Design a protein around this ligand. Structure first.
Ligand SMILES: Oc1cccc(-c2nc(N3CCOCC3)c3oc4ncccc4c3n2)c1
Lengths: 1058, 317
């Protein structure tokens, strides 16, 4: 029944929304927030209110909007403005009061009640009493409570509840006992009266039901003396665990207040105040602590802080920092620590070890904050550098363990290193200089390394940032003995596991010319070979076949080393990767492109020295002789022609003719035409012709490409599917499919001529961003994640790509709908061309019209509409949407940071089962797409029209935007871990090629890209000078992604109308 | 065709530039303008030949030889060429390109090169020449209006509201008023300090008109200096009183039911000599002759296959 109730609500919401489509009215708008409420979709509905505001200032009073937007603090001073400008107005008071009772302002709420009691209005007399009852409850005065309770009817759950509290104070137990059960049944029948269309009052009934069973433990805590620990435990666990926004917990503690004074709870109230500060209610949190201190809202302001409760003071201190007064905060910290170390050293009479310990750990938190704040107040220069290092080392001493302490110290040293480096490149722009620098850097490099090492061991399974940082120092310091020893120490010290995170970065530096550096890499790589090979073979196999000598060389040693230990696995992996690259581009396929290229250099460029370079390896490639049936059947139909076609080429080399050379091209154009014919006839490949070795493979010990992780039983290639569908494309990728030794099937994409290594690092970055999202509670609350896939490079040319199930490209999904609804696929396109035949050359202004015109004569439904027709139910439909919107918003923001261009309709797809979005192809990263010459992108991420449509109406206002700043919040918080990863493949030695394509040293270019990334993570992306906070940045971004002006410029294939 | 007292020219995306006979709606000659749409038409003060500012070229056909093909092309400039303006004494021409430059062209000489260049950040949408022939007003996509002193080469800039691209600018024959129209849909009016001859020539802001909701595409003063016209993407030409700055006559091509999705943008306009009539360029492939006072459609010049973005009009003796 219950699962069947939300169904009808979802289905009605569909039509309700499609009605709002037809005409946006306040009538529907009312019946929309409400129906989305029932569907316990809080934020989506909140977006309905954002629209309600932006188009109807019409349930009026900006204090009524601030109140419905639960912005009590905004609605209060709005109501103050509204009441002092106006008159009494019975309603304006009720609102002014509700704000207080949510803020927990019992001081003012009680006063506002008594001090204003003409209230000739009798409804004004009825509500009145409920608020002032609790106000008095909050302020002790039980007399006022009873007075105001005597005015609350015993029919209301409220009236029956406040009787239970007043009883429990005066110790009338079986009174309170019965008052509980009456209020229960008054609320049971009350959750059936407002059956569905109520406030957060079915969500706040859980606030009442919680309070009532808790109030039954307050009962338990009165006569029978033996749950004082049991009740406090559940009270404590169901707190750090429980997550109810500030306001509920006030009331919850007020119940517990009948029983335990804050001075015995302390940890409880500190934890609570802790949440008030984090959530952003400092004025409240302050009042929590002032009570706990038992001393002033430091009205005595020039006076020292009281060390009475070392824990409480520290909280007050950091509350003061987070508050305005932050120079004042720093000052009370220095002194607090001084007092604390003296309260330790002298006041510790041995039989006091626990207090000494907890005292020492609180101190380390203090030093951390002291250094943090010094950096915040002064920045990084010759005076602060040693002082904060002093602070951090001090924190390191007092806790020894603790990730943050060691980390903070490493980063300080590493930024000390950076500070001088970047000061010295500054010097060089305008011999004793280098020596002092050498000693300077050596002084800070070695601690940095050491710190990062003790930090990593304290992170375990969560150290990617630190681990890479170790590498920056390792790789970046062409090694001075001092640094190398520190590294060698760490290598021995820290677990092997660690380095798996980092393997491609390491392999990018096998052929390291720096000799002390290289040794350690190789030795470490071999150790990583000893425990978990598998994690090594695939990548090492790639490296060992590499034009660059020193690379493949040093790679082979490691493999050799691994054979004395895991030989057939090395041999298995060897052959599998070998065979797969054969299957990727077949002999004739390589010949076709080669013949196209050769005809461009010669017939269209007059370049025979380039042309010969094109053909010669193709001839040498076959000189080795055929190796598979497919290779021989080409050799017959074409071989003789080509072998003699090269003969004419080599008669010209020596003769220098042009008639010798035209006999060759005579032969070359023959096979070309033959192959071009057989090309659209490649729609399948049978293994037994193409690679029999792969058909042979049975129950191997090689693990299914990119499945292996420790923790997880190794999944091996038990067999290969005998046929590979050839996805007919310009690069004809193969649908290779594998059999798991677990039983399940694994599908891949064998890609011929695309350097896949970039997408690997991108997937790596993603993994991190996934972690971060799983770790932010809010992002975890909403299931925010990036749908990722396995990327296994096989050379510079080829590689494998994990094939996510249940996914169709946006483009595909449309092409079906369009043909099914008898719409010409490229209808928008044709409209445009008919209007402006010279479209690509119009002025921006002209383009915007042609564009707008095309949009106004086409359905924006499509996507939205087919995802409704797909859904088997309606609740399924709804979730698939909630999924889609969130997941898309994620990769809108991440996509931005990575500078992800080229997001056309065949480059993102939708999981038809969950609705979650998925991005493929990560070639155009960083501003690259926008920097290009012809058809530059003006878009940050595709937020195209049929996407928007497919969300809830009130889309960008609802889930999308919220999810946007939620994700973006996380990213800015963790800006450094994210920058570690990115820096790591901007300056990756082998991957620097994607930036010299601005042409169709790099040191300078690379720096920019990385700054650009920081700018984006520090709200400086737009204007240099401003520092935009998240929601602004977000707003600005959504704007840029939506501008017709931007979209009409997008190259037509990108489909800026889809 | 340049022999008829009234020259009326029409261009657009249909690869022709068509000449019409004012008083009838009959098309005289048509010339081939292929490979590009036409961004701007202006008839030289000399009544000898007309200019077609296009994509990376300025083609110039002849009103006198009544037949042939482009007398002069001006190439070697990337991105669109947006505005054309001539200087009374024959041999000068100005342009504002998407290549962010304002260029001075010597008409009585060779070279696809130009005698001068003024360069800004952001594309230049419009270029017009102060009556005194000594200063050029240049408005770009950032929203800056530049005054270029053709003698002192002294760049002097002024942004009004803009972070918004300013679309066209004009200045009344009497040199008393300058006006600039932007993409928000606003129209800014300044009062001209007639420094001139040993020059100062300053600008004192007078009014902002909320001319339109959609893109405002062009503005133009009547020869009178009585009226100011505003063409817009809201499919409307609005004619305002210089005395009040109040709206006097509105011209529009807005369907007749909300469910039409527009059809036609009001690209350009040109007043008659006596300031009694106004001509209109629209994307619905038609030019239009209106009575400025009654707002009456007195003629409809239909002929272009594809849209119209360009007008040229002439009244000289
Ligand atoms: O990282 C890259 C680079 C280039 C191409 C691709 C790619 N990925 C694909 N998906 C990966 C995620 O799960 C579903 C399959 C993908 O599916 C395809 N289907 C047809 C043609 C090409 C592709 C294609 N290309 C991915």
């Amino acid at each position: 029944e219950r699962a069947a109730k939300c169904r009808a609500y979802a289905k009605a919401l569909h039509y309700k929304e499609l009605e709002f489509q037809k005409g946006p009215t306040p009538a529907i708008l009312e019946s929309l927030i409400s129906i989305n409420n029932k569907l316990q979709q809080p934020e989506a509905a909140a977006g309905v209110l954002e629209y309600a505001m932006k188009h109807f200032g019409e349930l009026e009073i900006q204090a009524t909007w601030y109140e419905k937007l639960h912005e009590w603090e905004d609605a209060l001073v709005a109501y103050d403005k509204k009441m002092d400008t106006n008159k009494d107005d019975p309603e304006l008071m009720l609102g002014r009061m509700r704000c207080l009772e949510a803020l927990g302002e019992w001081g003012q709420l009680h006063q506002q009640c008594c001090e204003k009691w003409t209230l000739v209005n009798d409804e004004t007399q009825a509500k009145m009493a409920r608020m002032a009852a609790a106000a008095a409850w909050g302020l002790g005065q039980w007399d006022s409570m009873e007075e105001y309770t005597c005015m609350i009817p015993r029919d209301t759950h409220d009236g029956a509840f406040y009787r239970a509290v007043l009883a429990l104070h005066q110790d009338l137990f079986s009174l309170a006992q019965q008052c509980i059960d009456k209020a229960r049944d008054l609320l049971d029948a009350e959750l059936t009266a407002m059956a569905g269309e109520s406030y957060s009052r079915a969500y706040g009934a859980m606030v009442s039901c919680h309070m009532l069973s808790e109030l039954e433990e307050v009962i338990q805590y009165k006569l029978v003396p033996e749950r004082r620990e049991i009740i406090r435990q559940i009270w404590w666990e169901r707190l750090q665990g429980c997550q109810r926004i500030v306001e509920d917990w006030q009331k919850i503690l007020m119940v517990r207040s009948l029983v335990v004074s804050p001075h015995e709870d302390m940890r409880t109230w500190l934890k609570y105040a802790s949440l008030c500060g984090k959530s952003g209610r400092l004025a409240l949190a302050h009042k929590t602590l002032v009570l706990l201190l038992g001393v002033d809202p430091s009205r005595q302001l020039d006076h020292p802080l009281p060390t009475v409760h070392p824990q409480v003071t520290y909280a007050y201190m950091k509350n003061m920092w987070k508050s305005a007064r932050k120079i004042d905060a720093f000052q009370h910290m220095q002194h607090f620590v001084q007092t604390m170390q003296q309260q330790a050293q002298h006041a510790i009479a041995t039989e006091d070890q626990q207090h000494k310990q907890e005292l020492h750990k609180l101190m380390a938190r203090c030093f951390l904050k002291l250094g943090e704040w010094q950096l915040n107040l002064q920045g990084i220069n010759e005076s602060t550098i040693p002082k904060v290092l002093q602070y951090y080392s001090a924190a390191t001493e007092h806790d020894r363990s603790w990730y943050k302490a060691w980390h903070a110290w490493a980063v300080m040293n590493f930024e000390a290193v950076l500070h001088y480096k970047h000061q010295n490149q500054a010097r060089d722009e305008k011999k004793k200089v280098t020596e002092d620098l050498s000693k300077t850097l050596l002084m800070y490099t070695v601690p940095a390394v050491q710190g990062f090492f003790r930090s990593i061991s304290l992170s375990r399974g969560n150290n990617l940032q630190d681990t890479l940082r170790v590498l920056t120092l390792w790789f970046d310091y062409g090694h001075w003995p001092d640094v190398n020893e520190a590294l060698v120490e760490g290598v021995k010290a820290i677990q092997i596991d660690t380095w798996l995170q980092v393997i491609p970065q390491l392999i990018a530096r096998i052929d390291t010319p720096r000799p002390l550096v290289g040794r350690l890499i190789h030795q470490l790589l071999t150790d990583i070979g000893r425990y978990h090979p598998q994690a090594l073979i695939y990548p090492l196999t790639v490296a060992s076949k590499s034009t660059t000598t020193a690379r493949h060389n040093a790679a082979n040693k490691i493999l050799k080393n691994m054979c004395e230990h895991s030989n057939t696995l090395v041999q298995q992996a060897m052959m599998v990767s070998e065979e797969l690259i054969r299957v990727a581009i077949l002999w004739h396929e390589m010949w076709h492109e080669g013949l196209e290229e050769a005809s461009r250099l010669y017939f269209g460029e007059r370049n025979v020295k380039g042309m010969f370079e094109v053909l010669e390896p193709l001839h040498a490639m076959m000189e080795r002789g055929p190796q598979t049936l497919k290779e021989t059947s080409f050799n017959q139909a074409y071989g003789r022609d080509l072998m003699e076609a090269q003969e004419w080429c080599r008669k010209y080399m020596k003769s220098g003719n042009v008639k010798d050379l035209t006999q060759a091209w005579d032969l070359y154009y023959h096979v070309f035409r033959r192959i071009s014919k057989q090309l659209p006839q490649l729609t399948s490949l049978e293994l037994q012709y193409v690679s029999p070795k792969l058909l042979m493979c049975r129950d191997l010990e090689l693990a299914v490409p990119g499945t292996y992780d420790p923790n997880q039983p190794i999944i091996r290639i038990q067999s290969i599917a005998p046929s590979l569908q050839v996805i007919t494309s310009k690069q004809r990728p193969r649908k290779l499919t594998l059999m798991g030794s677990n039983g399940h099937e694994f599908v891949f994409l064998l890609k011929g001529h695309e350097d896949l290594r970039q997408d690997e690092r991108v997937m790596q970055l993603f993994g991190l961003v996934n972690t971060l999202l799983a770790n932010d509670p809010t992002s975890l609350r909403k299931n925010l994640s990036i749908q990722r896939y396995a990327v296994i490079p096989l050379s510079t040319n080829s590689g494998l790509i994990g094939w996510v199930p249940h996914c169709d490209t946006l483009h595909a999904l449309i092409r079906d709908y369009r043909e099914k609804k008898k719409i010409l696929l490229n209808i928008e396109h044709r409209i445009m061309l008919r209007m402006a035949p010279d479209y690509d050359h119009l002025t921006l202004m002209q383009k915007v019209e042609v564009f707008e015109h095309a949009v106004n004569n086409t359905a924006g439904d499509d996507l939205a509409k087919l995802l409704w027709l797909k859904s088997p139910s309606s609740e399924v439909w709804f979730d698939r949407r909630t999924n889609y919107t969130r997941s898309l918003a994620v990769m809108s923001m991440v996509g931005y940071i990575l500078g992800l261009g080229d997001r056309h309709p065949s480059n993102l797809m939708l999981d038809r089962l969950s609705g979650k979005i998925l991005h493929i192809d990560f070639g155009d990263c960083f501003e690259v797409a926008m920097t290009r010459e012809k058809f530059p992108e003006k878009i940050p991420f595709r937020l195209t029209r049929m996407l928007t449509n497919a969300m809830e109406v009130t889309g960008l206002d609802g889930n999308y935007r919220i999810t946007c700043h939620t994700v973006m919040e996380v990213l800015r918080e963790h800006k450094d871990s994210v920058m570690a990863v990115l820096e790591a493949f901007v300056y990756d030695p082998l991957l620097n090629w994607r930036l010299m394509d601005t042409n169709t040293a790099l040191n300078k270019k690379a720096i920019q890209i990385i700054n650009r990334v920081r700018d984006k993570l520090t709200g400086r992306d737009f204007s240099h000078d401003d520092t935009l906070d998240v929601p602004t940045q977000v707003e600005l971004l959504i704007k840029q992604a939506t501008s017709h002006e931007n979209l009409c410029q997008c190259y037509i294939g990108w489909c800026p109308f889809w | 065709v340049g022999s008829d007292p009234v020259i009326l020219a029409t261009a657009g995306y249909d690869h022709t530039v068509r000449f019409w006979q004012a008083h009838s709606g009959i098309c005289t000659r048509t010339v081939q303008h292929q490979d590009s749409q036409v961004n701007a038409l202006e008839v030289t003060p000399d009544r000898s030949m007309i200019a077609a500012a296009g994509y990376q070229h300025i083609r110039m056909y002849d009103l006198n030889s009544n037949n042939p093909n482009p007398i002069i092309s001006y190439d070697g400039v990337n991105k669109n060429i947006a505005s054309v303006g001539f200087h009374e004494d024959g041999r000068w021409m100005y342009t504002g390109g998407e290549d962010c430059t304002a260029r001075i062209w010597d008409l009585r000489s060779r070279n696809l090169q130009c005698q001068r260049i003024f360069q800004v950040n952001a594309p230049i949408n419009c270029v017009c020449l102060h009556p005194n022939q000594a200063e050029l007003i240049v408005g770009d996509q950032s929203g800056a209006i530049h005054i270029w002193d053709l003698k002192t080469d002294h760049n002097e800039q002024l942004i009004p509201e803009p972070e918004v691209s300013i679309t066209s600018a004009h200045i009344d024959p009497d040199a008393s008023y300058m006006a600039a129209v932007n993409s928000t849909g606003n129209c800014y009016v300044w009062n001209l300090t007639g420094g001139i001859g040993d020059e100062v020539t300053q600008l004192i802001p007078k009014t902002k008109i909320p001319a339109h909701t959609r893109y405002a595409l062009q503005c133009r003063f009547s020869p009178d200096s009585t009226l100011l016209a505003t063409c817009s993407a809201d499919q409307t030409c609005k004619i305002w009183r210089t005395s009040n700055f109040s709206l006097m006559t509105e011209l529009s091509i807005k369907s007749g039911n909300p469910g039409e999705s527009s059809r036609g943008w009001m690209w350009g306009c040109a007043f008659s000599g006596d300031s009694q009539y106004i001509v209109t360029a629209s994307s619905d492939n038609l030019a239009r002759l209106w009575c400025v006072e009654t707002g009456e459609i007195k003629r409809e010049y239909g002929g272009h296959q594809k849209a119209v973005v360009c007008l040229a009009f002439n009244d000289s003796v």
